[PDB]
Design a protein around this ligand. Structure first.
Ligand SMILES: [Cl-]
Ligand SMILES: [Cl-]
Ligand SMILES: [Cl-]
Ligand SMILES: [Cl-]
Ligand SMILES: [Cl-]
Ligand SMILES: [Cl-]
Ligand SMILES: [Cl-]
Ligand SMILES: [Cl-]
Lengths: 259, 129
């Protein structure tokens, strides 16, 4: 009932993954709201239900497929389907609980987890922090398998949570940040797996604040600096929009554009 | 793997220069390419970058409207056209490969490859060759 974007890990290349993320971005935003050369996601307020979600179908070489559902308002994963079973993170209010009844409507075997999909919770359930969870094409292939096998009784919760952490970073965070897409491209290019460095983690943690600072900026300057980290962990402050233009590919809606 | 820069020199204020960054041993087509500059006693800084996707270009505020980056895939070369040069543009200029454009703000990537640099000096009066 929603647009679907397909990707496979089998034989994935820098190009196939790049083309995939581009398609995700193209379905998350209309392109009609662009500020400081950064697209803004749709405003949630009053957003019609047919416009609310997109579907991302992921397959691997073992012929397993899962379909993730992403909320267009924040690019984040809300649940998934494996065969004719569906699983949803705990929703935050009655409107969102109602919204997710419109996902995978041909699935009656539906379950809503008692937990949400935020990193703090998922790291607790996984027993590991993002800094110790490897990302790459291999991790993504394995995450697809683990999500699929939850539906057969074959994945326990820590592995499920780890697999969500992988998918959210490699799909949602890569769509949000061109820099993170680049970090995933490096892993594909060199056929390697590795945990995200501090630059990635701190960007992920800062997406909402960066979206605010950009949309509330005045003369391209932030009202208050945001502290980020370099790849070596060293800390630096950002005061202006321009240097973030290549880094950020999408922003959550915070306010109406200037008159 | 080599990245060779040429085109630097002494130019007058208001003048123009075109730098070249030519690759050997690999293809520039599938990387972002950035220009960076190091001026005396100053932090090394990203100047301009061109993506491997759809030719998207990015510029530091200080050079917007004066510098233009472009890529000639057939020649495995990237160029930096520098117009309306100012004394403040004097620096050693470097090109580097990256996966995506960052203007250097997160530091060097472990697999990024940098050239050895070309000096650009903006002054009306002669200087060291
Ligand atoms: Cl695979
Ligand atoms: Cl939409
Ligand atoms: Cl939102
Ligand atoms: Cl549960
Ligand atoms: Cl939670
Ligand atoms: Cl972490
Ligand atoms: Cl890596
Ligand atoms: Cl890029």
């Amino acid at each position: 009932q929603y647009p679907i974007i397909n990707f496979t890990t089998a034989g994935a290349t820098v190009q196939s993954y790049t083309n995939f993320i581009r398609a995700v971005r193209g379905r998350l935003t209309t392109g009609a709201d662009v500020r400081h050369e950064i697209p803004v996601l749709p405003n949630r307020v009053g957003l019609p239900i047919n416009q609310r979600f997109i579907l991302v179908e992921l397959s691997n070489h073992a012929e397993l497929s899962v379909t993730l559902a992403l909320d267009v308002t924040n690019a984040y994963v809300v649940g998934y389907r494996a065969g004719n079973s569906a699983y949803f993170f705990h929703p935050d209010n009655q409107e969102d609980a109602e919204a997710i009844t419109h996902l995978f409507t041909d699935v009656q075997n539906r379950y809503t987890f008692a937990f949400g999909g935020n990193y703090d919770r998922l790291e607790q359930l996984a027993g590991n922090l993002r800094e110790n969870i490897e990302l790459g094409n291999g991790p993504l292939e394995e995450a697809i398998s683990a999500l699929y096998y939850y539906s057969t009784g074959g994945t326990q919760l820590p592995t499920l949570a780890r697999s969500f952490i992988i998918c959210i970073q490699m799909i949602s965070e890569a769509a949000r940040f061109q820099y993170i897409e680049g970090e995933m491209r490096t892993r594909i290019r060199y056929n390697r797996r590795s945990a995200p460095d501090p630059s990635v983690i701190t960007l992920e943690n800062s997406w909402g604040r960066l979206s605010t600072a950009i949309q509330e900026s005045n003369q391209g300057a932030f009202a208050s600096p945001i502290q980020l980290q370099r790849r070596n962990g060293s800390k630096f402050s950002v005061y202006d929009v321009s240097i973030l233009i290549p880094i950020i590919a999408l922003m959550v809606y915070r306010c109406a554009p200037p008159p | 793997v080599q990245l060779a820069e040429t085109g630097g020199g002494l130019v007058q204020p208001g003048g123009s220069l075109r730098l070249s960054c030519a690759a050997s041993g690999f293809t520039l087509d599938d990387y972002a390419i950035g220009w960076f500059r190091q001026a005396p006693g100053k932090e090394r800084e990203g100047v301009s970058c061109i993506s491997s996707s759809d030719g998207r270009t990015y510029y530091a505020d200080s050079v917007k409207g004066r510098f233009t980056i472009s890529r000639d895939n057939a020649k495995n070369t990237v160029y930096l056209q520098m117009n309306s040069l100012k004394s403040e543009d004097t620096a050693v200029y470097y090109c580097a490969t990256e996966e995506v454009c960052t203007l250097g703000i997160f530091g060097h990537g472990p697999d990024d490859y940098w050239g050895q640099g070309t000096q650009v000096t903006v002054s009306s009066e002669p200087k060291t060759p």
